[PDB]
Structure 1
Amino acid sequence: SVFSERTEESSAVQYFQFYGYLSQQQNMMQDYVRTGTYQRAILQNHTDFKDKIVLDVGCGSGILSFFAAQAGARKIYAVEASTMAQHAEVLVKSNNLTDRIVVIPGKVEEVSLPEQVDIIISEPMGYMLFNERMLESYLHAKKYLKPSGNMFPTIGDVHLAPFTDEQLYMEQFTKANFWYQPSFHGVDLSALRGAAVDEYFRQPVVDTFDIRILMAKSVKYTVNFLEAKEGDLHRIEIPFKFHMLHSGLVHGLAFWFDVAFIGSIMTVWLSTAPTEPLTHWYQVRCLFQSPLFAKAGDTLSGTCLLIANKRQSYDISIVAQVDQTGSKSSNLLDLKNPFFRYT
């Protein structure tokens, strides 16, 4: 199958076992912005669901299929690969919806559906949007979509901006300095100093922050889910050119994302920006090993490149330079092993 060709078994086992625990579903359901915004988007475009056929990709507990059932859908196929699939069936029966919601256990790349559908629904966004590589499963499912069908969400916007933060940078540098010692219980550790700094700085930082640390207006990269192909996501290249609004030290780049549900009656937006109320995705920051000095009015140009790997994530390469001086920085991050700093 297409899924098994691109994924380590070892990663997949752990991945689907993780989502088999009820406590993680509980943790996800309790993010009110998320759950409420999805329900808003589905119910306010009810004519896109009334008497239609629906596909839910990766239903988990089943909550989204229930929303589609509320809006008047005629038939819903709910696909799920973890053991949570057995808990979903229990809720379908105790809620008297056996005539409308059909649970199909397995991977969407591997199951057979009985008919083509009018519309697809899913929640496939990870950290920085792309983590976990589930977006590829979402696009694959378009093999079941009619020529005039729709997708919910319809498009995704990724946002990038430069930031300054001394305190975070010193905190990570302090940890690395352990390996600088010439006599730990009589043993010299210093030969490993270089290896330790590299390891710590490859960890992306997950938390939130005050918007006043941003040093320029953000740049946007848009993916249209109606038009895009699966193959498009194996190599993602994002160019940027910033016009600096403030002078100072740039310690790295900050990331977040928006998605849009474009229905027949209206468009509804879900956002994880630092100007909006907090969600379980927070925001994401990538540090430079050495900061760049820039003055107001200068331009900061470069590229962010994402290449998918077999542990269901991405290798990230970031290169940036201040155009007026030639000061240049490069860095590598492993999205697989983040540092959770919050509270």
Structure 2
Amino acid sequence: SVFSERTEESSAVQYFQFYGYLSQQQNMMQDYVRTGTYQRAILQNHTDFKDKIVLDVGCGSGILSFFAAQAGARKIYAVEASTMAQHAEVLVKSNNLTDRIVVIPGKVEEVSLPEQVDIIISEPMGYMLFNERMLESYLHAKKYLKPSGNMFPTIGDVHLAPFTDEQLYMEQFTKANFWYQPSFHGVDLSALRGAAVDEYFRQPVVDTFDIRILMAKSVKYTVNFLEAKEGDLHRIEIPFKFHMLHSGLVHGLAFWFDVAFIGSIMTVWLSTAPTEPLTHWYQVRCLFQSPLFAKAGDTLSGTCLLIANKRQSYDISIVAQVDQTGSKSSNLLDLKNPFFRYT
């Protein structure tokens, strides 16, 4: 199948084991911004759902299908690959919606749906939008989408901005310098210090931060889910040119994302920006191996290349240069294993 060909089994097992927990669905559901914004988007665009056929990709508990039901959908196919699928069936039955919602256990790449749909709904966004690579299943599901059908969310924006955080940068060495001692219980650990430094810097940092550490307005990379194909997400090249608003040391790049629901009545935005209330996605920061000095007015240019890997995640490659000085720094990060710093 399409899913299995792009994912090591070991990862998929863990992934769907993870989403089989009611506690995780609860964790997502209790994020008021998320759930409220999806509900707001679906109900305020009721003309996009009333008497329509809907597909819920990865329905989990089923919450979005029930929202689609509130909006008047004629028939909702709710596909779910984890065991959560049975619980969804339970909720469908207990909410007297069996005539309207059909739970389909399995992967959307592998199940067969009987008819074309007017609209697809889903919540496939991970850290940095793309983590978990579920966006590809979302795009894959358009094989069941009627031409001129719609996608909720309709588009996704990834934002990048350079940041300064001396303490975060210093933290890595403070942790790694554990190994820089000649007699830990009589053992010289120092030979592993460089390896420890490298290991820490390959971890993207998941947490939030004060927006005051940001040194330039973000660069935006847009995925239009109506236009994009699954293959578009295998290699994501995000060039950037930052016009520095502040003078100082740039320690790395900060990441967050927005998604938009573009309905017939209105467009509704779900934002994970550090200027907005915190969500369960937080934000993500990728350090440069070496800080770059920049003056306000200078340009910081380079590339963030996201390469999809077989663990349902991405290898992140960042190259940055201060154009005015030629000072250069890069980093390569493994997004499947982020460091959760939030407290």
TM range (shorter): over 0.9
Quote how far apart the aligned CAs of 1:57 are: 0.2
Deviations 1:102-153 (A, max 9, x none): 0111011111111111111000000000000000000111111111211111
User: What secondary structure is seen at the aligned counterpart in 1 of 2:318?
Assistant: strand
Counterpart of 1:94?
A: 94
- For residues 222 and 22 of structure 2, what CA distance do their matches in structure 1 show? 34
Q: Per-residue displacement from partner, 1:44-97 (whole Å, max 9, x unpaired)?
A: 111111111110000000000001111111100000011111111111111111
SS in 2 for 1:185: coil
> Shift in Å at residue 329 of structure 1?
0.3
- Partners of 1:185 and 1:284 lie apart in 2 by 37
Alpha-carbon distance in structure 1 between the residues aligned to 2:268 and 2:334: 33
Give distance in 2, aligned partners of 1:131 and 1:271: 16
The whole-number CA distance in structure 1 between the counterparts of 2:265 and 2:193 is 60
- Find the aligned partners of 1:241 and 1:22 in 2 and give their Cα distance: 43
1:14 to partner: Cα distance = 0.9
Which residue is equivalent to 1:261?
261
Offset at residue 326 of structure 1 (A): 1.0
TM-score when normalising by structure 2:
0.98
Instruction: Quote how far apart the aligned CAs of 1:246 are.
Output: 1.2
Q: Is residue 249 from structure 1 mapped to residue 249 from structure 2 by the alignment? A: yes
CA–CA distance in 2 between the matches of 1:266 and 1:39? 13
For residues 289 and 265 of structure 2, the distance between their equivalents in structure 1, rounded to whole angstroms, comes to 49
Q: CA shift at 1:249, angstroms? A: 0.7
Paired with 1:158 and 1:281, the residues of 2 have a C-alpha distance of 13
**Taking every aligned residue pair, what percent have the same amino acid on both sides?**
100
Q: CA RMSD in A?
A: 0.8
Distance apart, 1:267 and its partner CA: 1.0
- Distance, in Å, in 1 between the alignment partners of 2:330 and 2:89 is 49
Distance 1:219 1:148 in 2: 30
Find the residue that maps to 1:162 and give its secondary structure. strand
Deviation of 1:165 after TM superposition, in Å, equals: 0.7
Partners in 1 of 2:148 and 2:13 — Cα distance?
36
Please list, as runs of the form range in 1=range in 2, the aligned pairs for 1:268-307 lying within 5 A after superposition.
268-307=268-307
Q: Distance in 2 between matches of 1:259 and 1:335?
A: 20
Answer with 172-181 or 120-129: which moved more.
Answer: 172-181
Report the Cα distance in structure 1 between the residues aligned to 2:248 and 2:48, rounded to whole angstroms.
50
Q: After the TM superposition, which of the residue ranges 293-302 and 76-85 deviates more from structure 2?
A: 293-302
1:135, 1:142 → 2: CA distance?
A: 12
Could you report, residue by residue, the CA deviation over 1:255-292 in whole angstroms, capped at 9, with x for unpaired residues?
11111111111111110111111111111111112111
Tell me the residue number matched to 2:67. 67
Kindly tell me the number of residue pairs found equivalent between the two proteins.
343
Q: Which runs of 5+ in 2 are unaligned?
A: none
**Deviations for 1:229-265, whole angstroms, at most 9, x for unmatched residues?**
1111111101011111111111111111111111111
- Following TM superposition, by how much is the alpha carbon of 1:26 offset from its aligned partner in structure 2, in angstroms? 1.3
- CA distance in 2 between counterparts of 1:290 and 1:260 reads 35
Q: Determine helix, strand or coil for the equivalent of 2:133.
A: coil
- Give the structure-1-normalised TM-score: 0.98
Distance in 2, Cα, partners of 1:186 & 1:148: 70
Distance 2:84 2:266 in 1: 33
Query: Which SS does the other structure have where 2:173 is aligned?
Result: helix
What are structure 1's unaligned runs of at least 5 residues?
none
SS of 1:257's partner is strand
Distance 1:251 1:202 in 2: 14
Q: Distance in 2 between matches of 1:278 and 1:30?
A: 12
